[PDB]
DNA sequence: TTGATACGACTGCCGAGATTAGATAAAGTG
DNA sequence: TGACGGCTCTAATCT
DNA sequence: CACTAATAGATTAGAGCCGTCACGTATCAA
């Protein structure tokens, strides 16, 4: 309250309040665990969680009422009607036992659900505003991100990987075609060699790029020698990344369903953000690169609704002077595609007027 | 009270004065008068004290004696420890677990019979059972007193039957590794009654 | 104490520019050395106009900005520049914001900025941010974020002022934000514009921002924490680091309170080491791929050409390529089981310690994964792989650092804009990013080699050798964590620690002269002061001394012994010996005390020690607190029973609090009761004043109030506090009263000015010195946090200084495993030196006045008397009362020399064993290591006993640049024979006091070797001596093992090639060249084994080893090989036994004759052919 | 305060007052000052007086007579203390009481933690200074306790330990000796002869 | 040259203070 | 169903 | 935005617990 009176960035105070609330949340678990026939104080997220939920379903009469009214997320799978505002519907929720907040759009809870959209006309501006902040917040270098993905993709073909994930990949032939496409265009555009500099570039006075062997790099200063139409270099890499990310999303879905099926449990595992992030972390990619790849991937007609906007911006830094980071901002999730994805996970209603 | 007094003498962090301890041991020297090894160990301890600093906790003296070879388990060092316990203001080891003619741990170690007044002229008779082995540093449980009440006969019934009861109480099968507080045929009666209870739920 | 001495010292330091020597000066605190050095530094800076100086202190109040300005005003020539222009203080961000806001409140801001609306808005925003930062500090913390907010607001304010400055200077700033990269020339226009401005606004701007023109600055005053940290340029958004800044070149950093800086540097290094963590597997794979990327001609021209120019690059490539195959690091590690406690694996330079339970362990092809689990099955050796990866990473980082410096100097000589260029943190990061690593990977791989190197190629007459291992390899500890984010692999979080405070000081000494000032600068302790031995070893002539540049009169005045003796100021010390009761802390001479009051006092004491806050099963022994309370109350009684005890200063290490450990109210009530009980007529007017941070008033305020109560009040006071509260300085002197003027002693020498303040005041008449607190961090449990790292680093420091053997280190590590603290080391000179340093600093504040009480009294517990020492510190250069205390501590002593020598011997043997184990692990991989091993063993054999000079002059010692196995023992009596008792023969532990194993030529069989005809001529031919000439250094048992091995090797080669008349060709193929000794006709293998004592335990283990080596050899050569092991000497009957392994009990007896010629010849000839 | 209670009830509590307060009149209570010569009228045998003197005692060495209102003497220190996963502080004391036949009982009493006051149940508060539990009649600052031990593991106090004096003082025999020595010292006037355990002779 | 009987079975240490810069990082409405 | 045996919590009894 | 309300003890009697069934070492008899 004092912080709110201060008119300040609510991030620090929100984190402190979240810690304070997590303390009492954990207190509830440590009270319930020894009460029920369990202990071990993830609190056995496959076994003793079920024991806790069963214990709080048969002995309590009024305490269960308070627990359900206060903390609905304690046992969400058995909850029937989920009334919530759109902002919380798109800004994730904090599970009872776990500390990290799982996202609504990916939770197995939303599987085969019926989502009534009251004031559905207003679920457009919120989605667009959240998407634009998400796109602006997460940035990565296109050149490093592409080459890192190809090395991880080449890792699959050449054995390696835990096999559990390896099979699915060797099957479904297109895995080899994306790889030979990558290897083919890597030689064409020399992304193996580090770019060099000496304004935004929107997509739906120009720059060129040779390959001075002496320098063993490529220049991009304007004196047109061997312009391979770098302006066409950008879209080829973009579309390859899109296709590879869709393929990785499909493999992540397969690995998700497999992992959840062998680990029979109480509807709580592998929220398919974890699946894709695990796939990318096994492939040798950074956290930010994994985030960008998943954002590009989650896409499974006009020009905007087909490929969207892709703005690029060069930069330079004394911290890294021998290379130039081609920073890429990507936007492909228009609100219509968000509605379509929510339409794949569940089905919507139209109470708007 | 005697246990407290002896453990105060054997207290580890008890500070001691080198000059005072040396003078006390010198004055107590004539009273030793034992065998060759006993007096030799006493003189070795007496000469060892001078080595350390003017003031020291008793642990330092104990460690110095142990390093010098004065292991308390030895026959010579044990008599020195007993002499220090009886007469000196300190002792490296206390003679509590030892079996002595008048031990403060009496009644917790053997089988005996007692005659408590319990007022005027009733002459109530009791007995106790203690662990045959030497007592360990800790003893979890006390030793209860059974009662010997002659239902029939004169008072000599106890004085003539108690040796037989004690003989029955010195057995190994009834209680694992210990004496049995009650005679061994009580075990037979208890097992026989349990056998009946297995077939007669009316008495369970 | 004269300014000329310090000026000459500065001149001498500046005269050693090509070498950057280090200066240490130890003088008592009561001389005002800071003021004198300020005056001298200011005079030199004013005179030379090219000289830079960094006055670096610990605490803010010791900066003495006003002293600097008054000295500048006093000696600022006759034509002068503004003090704010030349000498400026680099404050921290908070302090800068605080000063800016305070100036805004009292309107010190010039009208140029205050009239700006945009700057007014920015400053209002800054004030709003600070009013929160303040509250954040005072509240929820996690202040890292807060700080980022404050830095952003301050940068916005700086942007506003630079914008208006450029607007008024006719400079156009080219413009999701404007690129505020003002051209070097625009910076020049701004600087000259503020120069042309009136003096007031330019002075304010320079004072509030020293970074505006830092190149023109000459003397920079800043705290140690800020100096080791970074700073923000006035124009540049990000922050540059002082350590890498070009401004440090040919500078003169002055470290006031030199010894106290090590604690701050070490804590900062620990915090930064823990802040940076990375996944070992990923980091290694990405670095290896980058190292393959350069060696395919894919990198730009500059890096690729320089990288391939050296063979070390190819060696590192081969190392990585074979390491990947060895430990299968192309795959992923997945600890499938959910460990009840994952724990951490710490790799100290002594052992690979695991936090809990069985050490982690196999490749699993059918599942195509590495398990990394706690099961007996382990193929790929993990505990080997973690050190193996760490060493390769360190080497690769060192190589990359060298190439980065080459590239930096290239680009710097290329560019023409000198003012702002690549400063070597930038070059390393650029190269790492060019390889393809992320920012976190770049940081973790740059914090490994950091900057320490051989300075390209600079030959110097000195050789920097050091046997300490913690300061060369450091400690690295790893953590295993698995998260639902990455279910496939298990992240091995690795955090390293290499930059010790001594290493940081040495790196600083590579670019700037360092002058150190402290009262105890040269105290030989490795806990609070720098490792003086390590610095001396690595510097040599560069470690100069300060006493050579002081007047003799100052040294004579430092004595104070003759004055005290002449005026009959006797110092008496009283020891406190209490057990549990109050009866022995009260005067026995009196009897007025009724036993009821004593009984009540004991009862309240028992209640108070019962009030002790429950610990985590540490088991409150109501005894220690009772002892401390009784010692304090004995001090109280002694203070009350002496009318001449005017002033007194009790000094515990606990500030009294509300709990029962130290209870302020209980102490006050006990003082009042004791006053009423034993005072009677002597302490009828005494008073106790507790000074602490608990009280709202400042420490100086409370001390002044108590001393005023003494002086004008007329009553004697007792001051009680902690050692850490009353800092060095903080003089406790009070104006003299009538009674105190009636009896005193004026120590002032004849001829002093009668009107002098120091002659008009008095010092304390008595101090009570309580027990000293934590010297070696006592903390449980050993988590992976700052406290645990500090404790283990303290233990490693003690081990390197040769003060604790491996036995104590292993015991302490096992104690940490079970969360049970162990005993402090009995014989550790650093511990007692730190104890005496604390007590000396406490006592140094009683000799700051000319007048003295005729009887100074000192009271302390017995353990304080026991823990004090005199080694290392000159007696003449300390307070006279400390001399009396030392004289009275002659009974309570603990000898250092003999146990320290024994521990040094054991540590030398253990380090030699560890070096040989390490080189055995790396034996077949590298070629340089094999050459070093061979040369070292042959020097071992050629020089069994060597002199110090003859050892240093050797080529192996010269080329190794560190003690690798060449750490001989210290032969004190020049003995040719010494006997040791082995303990855990597989860990190099040897108790040198106990007998049981001989290390001599006779023990090695060299005399029996001599009794064989022809071996003498071969030995003299190979320069191998036949007997051990006496010398000042001798081999250690770990060295003796390889001595025996090579002696047996050569003797057996000669004997077998002479008796059998066949040539044994040594294995000339590298990998098998260090695997087996000799071969012949490509089908037999000969491996002689000289071992005399030879514990027969588990010979089948030796069979398994030799068979495994034979199988590896056969797999290498695809041929049938037969091994013939031979013992050169045997005290048992000869008895060959076959199996392809052949066996020979012995070849020559003690008479040098063959044992069983017919049967042996028959069997060997039959099987071999 | 002690508890007079017998099968022939003529009282329910005894109050030892240094200065008698104004005796009030409350329905359902009969309060009347008595004399020790008429102490036989209410079946007050010479054993509740020793119980009062025992109730005035403390566990600490070298203690005095401190006034107390708890009817029973319950002795517990910091050693006999443990916490659960709910951080429920659970001490266990050593109840000392002299019965109608002048036998000392040292039964173990276990106390559990309750957050809020219970007006219907007995509430106990740990007096840390005196090292003994005390009855709580009104809400008081601190942490309240109630009798009971519902956790799985029991609580046993060792009978006697001879490891050292500190360990001896934390056992039944050691605590009893501490209390008895205290009582024999501070209440010297109140007893014609000291409190000692009855000595008896072993027969067989 | 071994089969009894009387006694050993060892726990460490014991705070205050002062200086820095450090990307991040959510989802709110009475 | 190792079993003996002290003894501790706790339900029972008793106003 | 909200609570007020206003509450057997003391002493035995028994089921069921833990925990102790002693162990490695100097040492006199036979």
Whether any strand F atom is under 7 angstroms from the Cβ of D159: the reply reads: yes
Please judge whether D164 and B163 are an interchain contact, meaning their C-beta atoms are less than 8 angstroms apart.
Answer: no
Buried b (16+ CB within 10 A) or exposed e, C54-91: bbbbbeeebbbbebbbbbbeeebeeeeeebbbbbbbbb
Alpha helix stretches (DSSP H) within C1029-1098: 1037-1059, 1070-1073
- Closest alpha carbon within chain A to D88: A31
Report residue A345 as tokens.
Answer: 């996970």
> What are the angstrom distances between the C-alpha of C597 and each of C484, C569, C628, C674?
68, 37, 20, 10
Return the residue matching tokens 């070490």: C266
The full DSSP string for C269-281 is HHHHHHH--EEHH
- A87 in contact with nucleic chain E (CB within 7 A): yes
The rounded Cα C381 to chain-centroid distance in angstroms is: 32
Are the beta carbons of C761 and C731 closer than 8 angstroms? Answer: no
The answer to whether residues C817 and C811 touch, using CB atoms and an 8 Å cutoff, is no
- Check: CB of residue A131 under 8 Å from CB of residue A338: yes
Phi, psi of C369 (to 5 degrees): -160, 165
Contacts of C616 in chain D (CB under 8 A): none
CA distance C479 to C339: 12
If you measure CA to CA, which chain C residue comes closest to A11? Answer: C145
In chain D, which residues from 111 to 170 place their CB closer than 7 Å to nucleic acid strand G?
117-122, 152-154, 156
Rounded distance, CA B106 to CA C112, Å? 98
Nearest-angstrom CA–CA distance, C572 and C856: 6
The three-state (H, E, C) secondary structure of C733-791, written as one string:
CEECCHHHHHCCEECCCCCCCCCCHHHCEECCCEEEECCCCCCCCCCCCCCCCHHHHHH
CA A12 / C1′ G24 distance in Å: 63
Name the nt closest to D100 by C-alpha to C1': G11
Residue C689 annotated as part of some ligand binding site: no
Largest CA distance in chain A: 81
Q: Does residue C1035 come out as left (phi exceeding 0), alpha (psi in the -120 to 50 range) or beta? A: beta
Contact D33, D16 (CB under 8 A): no
Query: Does C333 show up as a binding residue in the annotation?
Result: no
Q: Which nucleotide is nearest to D117 (CA to C1')?
A: G7
The method recorded for this entry reads cryo-EM
Cross-strand bridge partners of residue C1084: C1080, C1122
- Tokens 């009353």 sit on residue: C726
- Whether the beta carbon of D173 falls within 7 A of nucleic chain F: the reply is no
* Alpha-carbon gap, residue C349 to C379, rounded angstroms: 24
Closest residue to E14 (CA to C1') is C773
Measured between beta carbons, which residues in chain D are less than 8 angstroms from residue C619?
79
Alpha carbon dihedral C809, C812, C813, C815, in 10-degree steps, equals 160
Sign of CA dihedral B195, B197, B201, B202: positive
Q: Which tokens go with C616?
A: 């985590």
Give how far B180 is from chain C: nearest CA, Å.
38
Cα distances (Å, whole numbers) of residue A104 to A22, A141, A342, C793? 20, 28, 10, 47
| Dihedral sign from CA coordinates of D65, D71, D75, D80 | negative
Q: Which nucleotide is nearest to D118 (CA to C1')?
A: G7
HEC readout, C1109-1121: HHHHHHHHHCCCC
Q: Is the CB of B134 under 7 A from strand G?
A: yes
Look up tokens 């989605």; give the residue. Answer: A127
Longest dimension (CA), chain D: 60
Give CA–CA dist C721/C650, Å, rounded.
6
Kindly state the tokens that stand for C851.
Answer: 């007048």
Instruction: Return the DSSP state at C678.
Output: I
Residue A313: how many CB atoms within 10 A of its CB?
Answer: 14
Q: CA B98, C1' G17: Å apart? A: 33
CA angle C792, C782, C987 (to 5 degrees): 50
- For residues C1034 and C944, the answer to whether their CB atoms sit within 8 Å is yes
Q: C607, D60: Cβ pair inside 8 Å?
A: yes
Non-local (6+) Cβ contacts of C735 within 8 A are C711, C712, C760, C761
Among C393, C326, C387, which residue's Cα sits nearest to residue C353?
Answer: C387
Whether the Cβ atoms of residue C341 and residue C948 lie closer than 8 Å to each other: no
CA–CA separation, A147 vs C290, rounded Å? 12
To which residue do tokens 């009794």 refer? C1011
CA A134 → C1' F9, Å?
62
Strands (E), C1035-1090: 1065-1066, 1078-1080, 1084-1088
Q: In 3-state terms, what secondary structure has residue C718?
A: strand
Mutation site for C-interface testing, chosen from A103, A154, A162, A252 by largest number of C Cβ within 10 Å: A162
Residues C566 and C488 sit within 8 Å (Cβ to Cβ): no
Quick one: tokens of D101? 């036949």
Contacts of C774 (CB under 8 A, 6+ apart): none
Is the CB of D47 within 7 Å of strand F? no
Among residues D151, D190, D204, D197, the alpha carbon closest in space to that of D55 is found at D190
- The annotation status of C646 as a binding-site residue, yes or no, is no
Please check whether residue D175 is in contact with residue B157, taking contact to mean a CB–CB distance below 8 angstroms.
no
Place of tokens 């001490």: D91
Query: Are the beta carbons of A193 and C298 separated by less than 8 Å?
Result: yes
Centroid of chain to Cα C106: 46
Chains near B with 3+ CB pairs less than 8 A apart are C, D
A15 and chain C in contact, CB less than 8 A: yes
Is C603's CB within 8 Å of D78's CB? no
At residue A176, φ and ψ (nearest 5 deg) are -80, -30
Instruction: Please give the torsion angle defined by the CA atoms of residues D15, D16, D20 and D24, in that order, rounded to the nearest 10 degrees.
Output: 0
How many degrees, rounded to 5, is the angle at CA C689 between CA C687 and CA C693?
175
A330, A235 contact by CB (below 8 A): no
Of C579, C866, C892, the CB nearest to B15: C579
Contact B15 C892 (CB under 8 A): no
Instruction: Strand E: list positions under 7 Å from protein Cβ.
Output: 6-29
C479 vs C355: CA distance, rounded Å: 10
The nucleotides of chain G lying under 7 Å from a protein CB are: 6-12, 17-28
Q: Does D166 touch chain C (CB under 8 A)?
A: yes
What letter does residue D133 receive in the DSSP assignment?
E
The span from the first CA to the last CA of chain C, in angstroms, equals 88
H/E stretch holding C857 reads strand C855-861
For residue C18, give the nearest of C255, C249, C253 by alpha carbon.
C249
Q: Could you give the residue ranges of the DSSP H alpha helices within C138-260?
A: 144-168, 184-196, 199-208, 224-228
Q: Which residue is nearest to nucleotide G25 (CA to C1')?
A: B73
CB C384 within 8 Å of CB C360: no
Contacts of C366 (CB under 8 A, 6+ apart): none
Strand G contacted by B141 CB (< 7 A): yes
C31 assigned ligand-binding residue: yes
Helix (H) or strand (E) holding A257: helix A230-262
Distance CA A176, CA A158 (A): 11
For residue A311, give the nearest of A139, A147, A127, A194 by alpha carbon: A139
- The separation between CA D13 and the C-alpha centre of its own chain, rounded to angstroms, equals 14
Taking the CA of residue A181 and the C1' sugar atom of nucleotide G9, their distance in angstroms comes to 89
Contact flag D161-B138 (C-beta cutoff 8 Å): yes
Q: DSSP secondary-structure letter at C511?
A: T
Touching pair B, A by Cβ (3+ pairs < 8 Å): no
Residue B108, classed as helix, strand or coil, is coil
d(CA C827, CA C505): 28
What the block records as the tokens of C826 is 């009995």
For C620, the 3-state DSSP assignment is coil
Pairing of strands C219-223, C53-57: parallel
Contact indicator for D59, D179 with CB cutoff of 8 Å: yes
List the D95 CA – F13 C1' distance (angstroms). Answer: 22
- The Å distance, CA of D122 to C1' of G8, is 10
């Amino acid at each position: 309250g004092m912080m709110k009176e201060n008119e300040f960035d609510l991030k620090n105070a929100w984190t402190m309040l979240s810690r304070a609330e997590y303390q009492v949340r954990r207190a509830m678990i440590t009270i319930l665990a020894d009460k029920a026939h369990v202990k071990l104080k993830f609190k056995l997220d496959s076994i003793s969680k079920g024991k806790i939920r069963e214990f709080v379903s048969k002995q309590p009469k009024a305490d269960s009422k308070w627990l359900n009214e206060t903390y609905p997320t304690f046992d969400l799978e058995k909850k029937q009607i989920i009334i919530l505002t759109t902002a919380k519907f798109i800004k994730s929720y904090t599970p009872f036992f776990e500390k990290r907040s799982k996202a609504f759009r990916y939770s197995p809870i939303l599987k085969d659900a019926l989502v009534v959209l009251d004031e559905f006309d207003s679920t457009k501006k919120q989605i667009l505003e959240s998407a634009i902040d998400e796109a602006l917040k997460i940035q990565a270098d296109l050149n490093s991100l592409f080459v890192d993905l190809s090395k991880g993709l080449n890792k699959v073909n050449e054995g390696q990987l835990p096999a559990k994930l390896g099979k699915s990949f060797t099957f479904r032939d297109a895995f080899k075609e994306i790889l030979n496409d990558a290897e083919q265009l890597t030689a064409e555009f020399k992304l193996d060699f580090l770019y060099k500099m000496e304004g935004f570039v929107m997509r739906v006075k120009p720059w060129n790029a040779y390959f001075d062997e002496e320098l063993r790099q490529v220049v991009l200063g304007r004196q047109p020698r061997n312009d391979l139409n770098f302006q066409r270099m950008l879209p080829r890499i973009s579309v390859f990344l899109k296709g590879a990310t869709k393929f990785i999303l499909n493999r992540a879905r397969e690995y998700q369903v497999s992992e959840n099926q062998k680990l029979s449990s109480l509807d709580d595992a592998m929220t398919i953000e974890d699946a894709c992030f695990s796939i990318y972390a096994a492939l040798g990619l950074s956290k930010s690169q994994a985030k960008i790849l998943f954002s590009l991937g989650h896409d499974f007609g006009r020009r905007f609704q087909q490929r969207g906007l892709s703005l690029f911006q060069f930069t330079n830094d004394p911290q890294h002077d021998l290379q130039t980071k081609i920073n890429a901002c990507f936007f492909n999730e228009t609100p219509e595609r968000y509605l379509l994805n929510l339409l794949s996970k569940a089905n919507v209603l139209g109470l708007s007027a | 009270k005697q246990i407290r007094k002896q453990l105060e003498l054997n207290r580890p962090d008890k500070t001691l004065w080198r000059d005072k301890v040396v003078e006390e041991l010198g004055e107590l020297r004539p009273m030793v008068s034992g065998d060759s090894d006993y007096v030799a160990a006493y003189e070795q301890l007496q000469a060892l004290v001078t080595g350390m600093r003017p003031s020291f906790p008793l642990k330092d003296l104990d460690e110095a004696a142990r390093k010098a070879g004065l292991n308390p388990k030895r026959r010579d060092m044990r008599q020195v420890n007993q002499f220090l316990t009886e007469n000196a203001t300190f002792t490296l080891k206390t003679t509590l677990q030892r079996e002595l003619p008048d031990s403060p741990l009496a009644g917790m170690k053997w089988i005996g019979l007692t005659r408590i007044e319990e007022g005027e002229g009733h002459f109530n008779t009791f007995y106790f059972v203690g662990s045959d082995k030497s007592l360990k540093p800790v003893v979890n449980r006390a030793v209860t007193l059974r009662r010997l009440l002659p239902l029939a006969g004169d008072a000599g019934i106890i004085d003539e039957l108690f040796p037989k009861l004690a003989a029955m109480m010195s057995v190994e099968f009834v209680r694992s590794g210990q004496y049995t507080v009650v005679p061994y045929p009580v075990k037979y009666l208890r097992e026989y009654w349990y056998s009946i209870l297995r077939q007669h739920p009316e008495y369970r | 104490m004269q300014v000329s001495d310090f000026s000459g010292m500065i001149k001498k330091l500046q005269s050693q520019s090509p070498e950057h020597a280090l200066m240490l000066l130890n003088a008592p605190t009561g001389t005002g050395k800071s003021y004198t050095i300020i005056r001298a530094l200011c005079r030199y800076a004013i005179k030379h106009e090219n000289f830079r100086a960094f006055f670096v202190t610990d605490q803010k109040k010791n900066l003495k900005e006003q002293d600097f300005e008054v000295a500048w005003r006093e000696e600022s020539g006759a034509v002068h520049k503004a003090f704010s222009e030349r000498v400026a203080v680099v404050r921290s961000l908070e302090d800068t914001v605080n000063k800016l806001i305070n100036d805004w409140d009292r309107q010190q801001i010039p009208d140029l900025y205050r009239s700006s609306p945009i700057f007014k808005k920015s400053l209002e925003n800054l004030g709003n941010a600070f009013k929160s930062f303040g509250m954040m500090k005072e509240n929820e913390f996690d202040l890292k974020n807060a700080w980022t907010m404050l830095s952003r607001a301050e940068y916005q304010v700086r942007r506003a002022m630079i914008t208006i400055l450029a607007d008024k200077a006719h400079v156009k700033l080219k413009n999701g934000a404007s690129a505020f990269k003002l051209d070097s020339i625009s910076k020049g226009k701004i600087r000259e514009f503020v120069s042309k401005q009136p003096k007031a606004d330019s002075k304010w701007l320079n004072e509030t921002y020293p970074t505006f023109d830092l190149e023109k600055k000459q003397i920079i005053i800043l705290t140690t924490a800020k100096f080791i940290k970074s700073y923000t340029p006035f124009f540049e958004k990000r922050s540059k680091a002082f350590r890498y800044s070009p401004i440090l070149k040919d500078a003169l950093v002055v470290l006031d309170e030199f010894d106290s800086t090590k604690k701050q540097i070490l804590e900062s290094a620990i915090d930064e080491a823990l802040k940076i963590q990375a996944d070992l597997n990923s980091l290694f794979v990405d670095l290896s791929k980058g190292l393959n990327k350069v060696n395919e001609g894919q990198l730009p021209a500059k890096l690729g050409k320089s990288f391939t120019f050296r063979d070390a690059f190819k060696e590192i490539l081969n190392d990585a390529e074979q390491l990947t195959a060895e430990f299968k690091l192309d795959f992923l590690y997945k600890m499938e089981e959910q460990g009840r406690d994952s724990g951490f694996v710490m790799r100290v330079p002594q052992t690979n310690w695991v936090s809990v339970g069985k050490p982690w362990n196999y490749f699993d092809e059918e599942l195509r994964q590495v398990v990394l689990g706690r099961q007996p099955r382990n193929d790929l050796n993990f505990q080997r792989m973690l050190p193996r990866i760490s060493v390769f990473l360190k080497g690769a980082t060192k190589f990359i650092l060298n190439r980065a410096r080459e590239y930096q100097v290239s680009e710097n000589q290329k560019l023409s804009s000198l003012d702002d260029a690549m400063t070597i943190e930038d070059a390393c990061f650029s190269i790492y990013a060019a390889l393809g690593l992320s920012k976190s990977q770049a940081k973790i791989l740059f914090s490994l080699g950091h900057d320490f190197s051989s300075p390209t190629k600079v030959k110097t007459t000195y050789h920097a050798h050091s046997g300490r291992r913690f300061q060369q390899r450091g400690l690295s500890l790893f953590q295993f964590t698995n998260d639902p984010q990455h279910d496939l692999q298990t992240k091995i979080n690795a955090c390293f620690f290499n930059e010790t405070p001594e290493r940081y000081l040495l790196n600083l000494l590579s670019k700037a002269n360092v002058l150190g000032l402290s009262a105890t600068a040269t105290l030989p302790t490795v806990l609070d002061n720098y490792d003086l031995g390590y610095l001396r070893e690595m510097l040599g002539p560069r470690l100069l001394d300060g006493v050579h540049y002081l007047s003799d009169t100052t040294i004579k005045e430092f004595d104070f012994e003759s004055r005290y003796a002449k005026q009959k100021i006797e110092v008496k010390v009283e020891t406190g010996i209490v057990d549990r009761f109050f009866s022995e802390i009260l005067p026995k001479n009196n009897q007025k005390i009724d036993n009821k009051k004593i009984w009540e006092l004991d009862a309240e004491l028992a209640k108070l020690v019962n009030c002790i806050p429950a610990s985590e099963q540490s088991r409150i022994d109501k005894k220690y607190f009772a002892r401390r309370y009784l010692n304090l109350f004995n001090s109280f009684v002694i203070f009350l029973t002496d009318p001449s005890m005017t002033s007194f200063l009790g000094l515990q290490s606990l500030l009294p609090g509300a709990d029962g450990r130290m209870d302020e109210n209980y102490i006050k009530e006990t003082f009042t009761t004791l006053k009423d009980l034993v005072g009677g007529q002597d302490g009828v007017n005494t008073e106790l004043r507790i000074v602490s941070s608990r009280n709202q008033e400042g420490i100086q305020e409370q001390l002044s109030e108590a001393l005023n109560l003494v002086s004008q009040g007329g009553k004697r006071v007792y001051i009680l506090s902690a050692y850490q509260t009353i800092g060095i300085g903080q003089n406790l002197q009070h104006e003299m009263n009538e009674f105190e003027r009636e009896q005193a002693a004026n120590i002032a020498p004849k001829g002093v000015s009668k009107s002098d303040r120091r002659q008009h005041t008095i010092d304390l008449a008595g101090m009570y010195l309580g027990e000293v607190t934590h010297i070696l961090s006592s903390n449980l449990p050993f988590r992976m946090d700052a406290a645990g790292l500090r404790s283990i680093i303290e233990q490693e420091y003690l081990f390197d200084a040769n003060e604790i053997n491996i036995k104590y280190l292993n015991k302490y590590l096992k104690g940490l495993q079970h969360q049970r603290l162990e005993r402090h080391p009995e014989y550790a000179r650093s511990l007692y030196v730190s104890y005496s340093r604390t007590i000396i600093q406490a006592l140094g504040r009683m000799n700051r006045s000319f007048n003295k009480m005729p009887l100074i009294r000192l009271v302390m517990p017995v353990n304080v008397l026991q823990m004090v020492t005199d080694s290392g510190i000159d007696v003449e250069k300390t307070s006279q009362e400390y001399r009396c205390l030392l004289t009275a501590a002659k009974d309570w002593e603990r000898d250092f020399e003999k146990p320290s020598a024994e521990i040094a011997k054991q540590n030398a043997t253990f380090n030699t064993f560890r070096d040989y184990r390490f080189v055995l692990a790396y034996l077949q991989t590298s070629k340089s290591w094999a050459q070093i091993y061979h040369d070292t063993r042959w020097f071992y054999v050629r020089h069994p006993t060597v002199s110090d000079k003859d050892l240093k002059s050797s080529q192996v010692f010269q080329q190794r640049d560190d003690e690798f196995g060449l750490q001989y023992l210290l032969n004190e009596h020049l003995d040719v024979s010494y006997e040791v008792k082995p303990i855990n023969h597989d860990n190099g532990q040897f108790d040198f006091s106990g007998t049981g194993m001989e290390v001599s030529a006779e023990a090695a069989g060299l005399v029996a070797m001599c009794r064989y005809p022809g071996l003498k001529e071969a030995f003299e031919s190979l320069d191998i001596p036949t007997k051990w000439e006496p010398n000042e250094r001798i081999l250690n048992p770990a060295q003796f093992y390889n001595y025996r091995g090579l002696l047996g090797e050569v003797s057996g080669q000669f004997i077998f090639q002479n008796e059998w008349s066949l040539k044994l060709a040594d294995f000339g193929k590298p990998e098998n060249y260090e695997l087996f000794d000799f071969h012949w006709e490509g089908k037999v293998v000969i491996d002689f084994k000289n071992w005399r004592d030879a514990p027969d335990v588990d010979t089948k283990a030796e069979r398994q080893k030799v068979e495994a080596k034979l199988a590896k050899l056969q797999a290498n050569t695809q041929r049938e090989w037969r091994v013939i092991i031979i013992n050169i000497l045997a005290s048992n009957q000869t008895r060959p036994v076959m199996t392809k392994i052949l066996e020979i009990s012995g070849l020559i007896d003690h008479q040098g004759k063959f044992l069983l010629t017919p049967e042996q010849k028959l069997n060997v000839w039959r099987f071999l052919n | 305060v002690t508890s007079i209670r017998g099968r022939y009830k003529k009282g329910d509590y005894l109050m030892m007052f240094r200065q008698l307060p104004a005796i009030p009149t409350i329905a359902g209570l009969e309060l009347h000052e008595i004399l020790l010569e008429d102490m036989g009228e209410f079946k007050i045998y010479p054993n509740h007086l020793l119980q009062l003197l025992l109730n005035q005692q403390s566990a600490n060495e070298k203690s005095l007579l401190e006034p107390c209102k708890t009817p029973e003497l319950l002795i517990s220190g910091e050693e006999w203390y443990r916490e659960f996963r709910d951080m429920r502080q659970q001490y266990y004391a050593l109840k000392l009481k002299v019965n109608w036949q002048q036998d000392l009982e040292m039964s173990v009493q276990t106390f559990t933690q309750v957050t809020e006051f219970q007006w219907d149940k007995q509430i106990y508060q740990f007096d840390e200074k005196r090292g003994r539990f005390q009855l709580c009649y009104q809400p008081s600052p601190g942490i309240y306790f109630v009798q009971g031990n519902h956790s799985a593991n029991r609580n046993y106090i060792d009978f006697l330990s001879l490891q050292n004096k500190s360990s001896f003082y934390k056992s039944k025999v050691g605590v009893v000796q501490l209390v008895l020595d205290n009582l024999n010292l501070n209440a010297e006037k109140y007893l014609l002869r000291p409190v000692t355990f009855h000595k008896s002779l072993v027969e067989h």
